[PDB]
């Protein structure tokens, strides 16, 4: 191209362009105010428009990296606000861009982003939609500088949709706040997913990843040949290693290039890519990424044939180990989209260990003949846990289910901070909600996607502030063994209970006027501190206090003098518990 700027602007459109440039600048220049970014974006946009007009005009032939970096280094407060980031401006590309990526603050020192009241948001949205949406895009972007800018642009659009629908509704808060809660929880899941994926690559390496991708891609495109899968596994690895390096343009290009190839070769991959591959560039890769599983081939044999009975089983494993175990994952995974990727890796790891031992032994077939008998319990364990948890989730509600997990987990690892025990337990209720409503097939995949995010975030938090050597064990295990380890954690016997604190169990009239979430988290917080104070307390003894307290609030939130009711009946109820259980 004569101008990289012009072509990108033309490709994206003025809106998407202005939006992405705003996210880009906000992720580097995290401490600068919104107005300063809008100034930069307007300047970079006018420059693009002049190049679109005259592609042979001044500076238009420069690389996007050079132009962005040059504009980054115009910023007056650069050395003032970041001392050794102004030292990046002394460097040529691509050392300068590398320098800029290495000076992004993973956690900036910015105040908690507060959600205004529904009426304030809806008025701001009505009165000035663009400023309200763009300021909050900037506020999120600067707090998550490694969040993939296009993905963040998609959330911004889904947020715009929620407001457009609900700010004209009869009951606005009832329409909007559930949607904003969902999008906040999907947004967090996305950032956590990006972190996990890249942390996993950096740690376990390209080989470990290739095993994951084979499994995943084989489930998604079962009608594709092992060759075509392997080819995509290779490309996707390049796409993944870049992106995880953190450059927006390289990552965007690589995802764009792969999406083009996938769409030009649909017939050799999948039939569900049709509509995805009619969508625009930015949406193309995202659509493909979130595309339905293709129907598995009608006529498929049993793996037993080529992976046990075949003459050349041990010959094939000898010739090329990784490729053969690669074929094993491919054949098993494509027959089982109902399986978690980690489950498939356990079967592959188990099959590997079997071939290692047996192909040495005198009669190989005799040895690994019953290899599938070892796969039965590995498959059955997660299938049981999911059904056992979805039964309980339905018998109770999400809330009462969260409370069940809360007691279960507090008793297992009570050294974890209350807010962590609460948020983890709450999040696993949300996993219960989403995944148990999916049909039996899509359940284990669903559970994996969210558990991976929940467990990794807990482990990240644990890395910072460690408490239990058993959480450190599960967190330092292989990703394949991480969930079963956590599942395996037993009730803590050695733990000495927490000292009683009067204020921890002191409740006020405010609890009556709090939103459902605010109320739930306060009650759940106390339920943890109760279990921490009395871990030997029986299932009967816990629901007794939980029922007694439920009657306490429901009575005292109907009283004419509510604050006095909570003071009076509160010290009464707490005292009755100190008798029922102990001080
Ligand atoms: C609703 C659902 C989702 O994402 O659709 C979900 C499932 C599990 C956890 C979370 C979540 O909120 C989370 C995000 C980041 C760190 C920890 C937990 C959200
Ligand atoms: C995440 C935060 C919340 O839920 O407290 C929030 C509250 C209200 C509005 C917005 C947005 O407009 C927005 C803009 C761009 C991307 C994502 C969201 C975000
Ligand atoms: C709202 C809060 C903050 O920004 O302080 C927060 C905490 C964690 C993750 C995220 C996100 O990445 C995100 C992205 C898009 C929409 C919603 C959330 C946001
Ligand atoms: C999947 C597994 C389960 O549901 O069996 C699970 C998921 C989340 C957490 C835990 C914990 O043991 C735990 C307990 C206390 C603090 C932190 C983690 C276990
Ligand atoms: C809770 C969800 C994770 C938020 C932690 C901060 C993330 C900062 C880096 C951005 C990203 O990786 O997407
Ligand atoms: C069904 C939703 C609630 C989830 C509760 C935890 C149960 C364990 C899930 C097992 C599947 C995870 C993937 C795996 O370990 O193979
Ligand atoms: C000294 C103990 C004081 C009371 C402890 C607080 C109990 C928390 C109850 C959590 C659940 C209440 C709601 C419900 O079960 O319907």
Curated annotation (Swiss-Prot):
Binding annotation for Cu cation: 1
Tissues of expression: Plasma.
UniProt cross-references to CDD domains, sorted A to Z: ALBUMIN
Domain of life of the source: Eukaryota
Annotated binding of Zn(2+), by residue: 65, 245, 247
Glycan attachment points: 10, 49, 135, 160, 197, 223, 231, 274, 279, 311, 315-316, 321, 349, 376, 411, 437, 442, 492, 523, 532, 534, 543, 571
Molecular functions (GO terms): antioxidant activity; copper ion binding; DNA binding; enterobactin binding; exogenous protein binding; fatty acid binding; identical protein binding; protein-folding chaperone binding
Effect of residue 126 to R: In Komagome-2
Xref: PROSITE patterns: ALBUMIN_1, ALBUMIN_2
Disulfide bonds: 51-60, 73-89, 88-99, 122-167, 166-175, 198-244, 243-251, 263-277, 276-287, 314-359, 358-367, 390-436, 435-446, 459-475, 474-485, 512-557, 556-565
UniProt entry keywords in alphabetical sequence: Calcium, Cleavage on pair of basic residues, Copper, Disease variant, Disulfide bond, Glycation, Glycoprotein, Lipid-binding, Metal-binding, Methylation, Phosphoprotein, Repeat, Secreted, Signal, Zinc
SMART domains in UniProt: ALBUMIN
Residues bearing PTM N6-methyllysine: 532
Domain Albumin: 1-184, 185-377, 378-575
Binding residues annotated for Ca(2+) 1, in chain numbering: 4, 242, 247, 250
Mutagenesis or variant effect for residue 363 to V: In Iowa city-1
PTM annotation (Phosphoserine): residues: 3, 56, 63, 271, 417, 487
Subcellular location(s) of the protein: Secreted
Positions of post-translational N6-succinyllysine modification: 203, 434, 517, 562
Biological function: Binds water, Ca(2+), Na(+), K(+), fatty acids, hormones, bilirubin and drugs. Its main function is the regulation of the colloidal osmotic pressure of blood. Major zinc transporter in plasma, typically binds about 80% of all plasma zinc. Major calcium and magnesium transporter in plasma, binds approximately 45% of circulating calcium and magnesium in plasma. Potentially has more than two calcium-binding sites and might additionally bind calcium in a non-specific manner.
Assembly mode: Interacts with FCGRT; this interaction regulates ALB homeostasis. Interacts with TASOR. In plasma, occurs in a covalently-linked complex with chromophore-bound alpha-1-microglobulin with molar ratio 1:2 and 1:1; this interaction does not prevent fatty acid binding to ALB.
PANTHER family named in the record: ALBUMIN (PTHR11385:SF15), SERUM ALBUMIN-RELATED (PTHR11385)
Protein name per UniProt: Albumin
Organism: Homo sapiens
Designated gene of the protein: ALB
């Amino acid at each position: 191209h004569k101008s990289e700027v012009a072509h990108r602007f033309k490709d994206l459109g003025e809106e998407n362009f202005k939006a992405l440039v705003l996210i880009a600048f906000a992720q580097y220049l995290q401490q600068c105010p919104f107005e300063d970014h809008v100034k930069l974006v307007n300047e970079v946009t006018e420059f693009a428009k002049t190049c679109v007009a005259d592609e042979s005009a001044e500076n238009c032939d420069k690389s996007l990296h050079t132009l962005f970096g040059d504009k980054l280094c115009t910023v007056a407060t650069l050395r003032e606000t970041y001392g050794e980031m102004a030292d990046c401006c002394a460097k040529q590309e691509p050392e300068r861009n590398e320098c800029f990526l290495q000076h992004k603050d993973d956690n900036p020192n910015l105040p908690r982003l507060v959600r205004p009241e529904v009426d304030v948001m809806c008025t701001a949205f009505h009165d000035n939609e663009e400023t309200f949406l763009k300021k909050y895009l900037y506020e999120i972007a600067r707090r998550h500088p490694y969040f993939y800018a296009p993905e963040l642009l998609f959330f911004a659009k889904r947020y715009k949709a929620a407001f457009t629908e609900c700010c004209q509704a009869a009951d606005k808060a009832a329409c909007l706040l559930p949607k904003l809660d969902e999008l906040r929880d999907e947004g967090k899941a996305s950032s956590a997913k990006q972190r996990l994926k890249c942390a996993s690559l950096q740690k376990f390496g390209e080989r470990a990843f290739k095993a994951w991708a084979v499994a995943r891609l084989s489930q998604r495109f079962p009608k594709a040949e092992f060759a075509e899968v392997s080819k995509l596994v290779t490309d996707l690895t390049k796409v993944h290693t870049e992106c995880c390096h953190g450059d927006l343009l390289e990552c965007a290009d690589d995802r764009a290039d792969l999406a083009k190839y996938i769409c030009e070769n649909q017939d050799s991959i999948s039939s569900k890519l049709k509509e995805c591959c009619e969508k625009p560039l930015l949406e193309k890769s995202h659509c493909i990424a979130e595309v339905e599983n293709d129907e598995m081939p009608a006529d498929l044999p049993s793996l037993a044939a080529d992976f046990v009975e075949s003459k050349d089983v041990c010959k094939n494993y000898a010739e090329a180990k990784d490729v053969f175990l690669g074929m094993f994952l491919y054949e098993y995974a494509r027959r089982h989209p109902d399986y978690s990727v980690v489950l498939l890796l356990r079967l592959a790891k188990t099959y590997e260990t079997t071939l290692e031992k047996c192909c040495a032994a005198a009669d190989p077939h005799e040895c690994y003949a019953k290899v599938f008998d070892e796969f039965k319990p590995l498959v059955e364990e997660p299938q049981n846990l999911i059904k056992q948890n979805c039964e309980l989730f339905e018998q109770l509600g999400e809330y009462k289910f969260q409370n069940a997990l809360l007691v279960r987990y507090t008793k297992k690892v009570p050294q974890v901070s209350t807010p962590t025990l609460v948020e983890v337990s709450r999040n696993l209720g949300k996993v219960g909600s989403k995944c148990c409503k999916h049909p039996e097939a899509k359940r284990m995949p669903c559970a994996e996607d969210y558990l991976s995010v929940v467990l990794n975030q807990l482990c990240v938090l644990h890395e910072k502030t460690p408490v239990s050597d058993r959480v450190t064990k599960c967190c330092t295990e292989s990703l394949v063994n991480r969930r079963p380890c956590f599942s395996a954690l037993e009730v803590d016997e050695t733990y000495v209970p927490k000292e009683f604190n009067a204020e921890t169990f002191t409740f006020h009239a405010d609890i009556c006027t709090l939103s459902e979430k605010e109320r739930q988290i306060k009650k759940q917080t106390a339920l943890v501190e109760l279990v921490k104070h009395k871990p030997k307390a029986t299932k009967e003894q816990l629901k007794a206090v939980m029922d007694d307290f439920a009657a306490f609030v429901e009575k005292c939130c109907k009283a004419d003098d509510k604050e006095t009711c909570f003071a009076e009946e509160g010290k009464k109820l707490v005292a009755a518990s100190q008798a029922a259980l102990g001080l």
